[PDB]
Design a protein around this ligand. Sequence first.
Ligand code: HEM
Ligand SMILES: NC(=[NH2+])NCCC[C@H](N)C(=O)NCP(=O)(O)O
Length: 244
Amino acid sequence: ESYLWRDSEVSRSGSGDEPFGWVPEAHSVFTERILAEEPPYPCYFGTQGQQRGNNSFSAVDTRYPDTHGPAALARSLRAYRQRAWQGPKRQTLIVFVGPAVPGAELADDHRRFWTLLDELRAYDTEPWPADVPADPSDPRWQWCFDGEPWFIFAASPAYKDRRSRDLGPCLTLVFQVRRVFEGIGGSTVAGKAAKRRVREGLARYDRIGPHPTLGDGDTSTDFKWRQYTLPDDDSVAAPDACPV
Ligand code: HEM
Ligand SMILES: NC(=[NH2+])NCCC[C@H](N)C(=O)NCP(=O)(O)O
């Protein structure tokens, strides 16, 4: 009944022509990308999380929205949130949305991303957190679910220049609770070092530099919604235009 998988469990998601039958290969492509030796994947935190067994997985099968869709993903997210606090601080949930769509454009995958986040909100059993503004135009808005804010971003095969966000053939959602950044806040010595190290990785991996909405690298960032769906170029969305 649970669609929350550790690495060793992903193979039980599905086999052959059945729901999630495409998930084990998507899992393998993802791990190949994040564990690659040369050039290394730019986010060493993601690589370390994979190497240490701290990445969990789920999926959405768009052919079966009533049974393998947002209602099931809300259950998986609640289970993951418990895991994220019981285990180590730097855990990530990676959610593959498939089957893969040949030739999809990036704008289409971003639309599907925001639609899925909206559908998930309908299955939340907890009120919105009192410490996070509910207005998506507020500089400090963040997406919330099950009582706390998350960082959540979209990966897609349609990222051609921002190769770091091409994690395989499927739209992929990367969820983290905010304890993952504890100790690397933007004003901290370790936080500035973290951004330096990742951005140097991007300069050895991607065809385009760090996106401006990630900030200059010496402070924390507002309007985090724009980071969820980075464009493949240097365009900058209007701050009050979050699609939620
Ligand atoms: C499978 C897991 C992960 C993946 C796929 C991933 C992916 C990425 C990517 C693609 C970027 C480049 C910026 C962007 O596209 O948004 C990035 C930056 C970053 N990530 Fe990771 N990440 C993962 C896990 C983590 C974790 C667990 C942490 C916790 C410390 C973390 C902290 C950071 C930081 C600090 C940056 C730099 C932001 C900046 O330069 O402004 N990541 N990550
Ligand atoms: N993929 C990606 N950009 N991962 C890093 C997200 C960092 C988030 N925005 C965060 O809250 N960082 C702490 P801050 O103090 O604002 O830099």
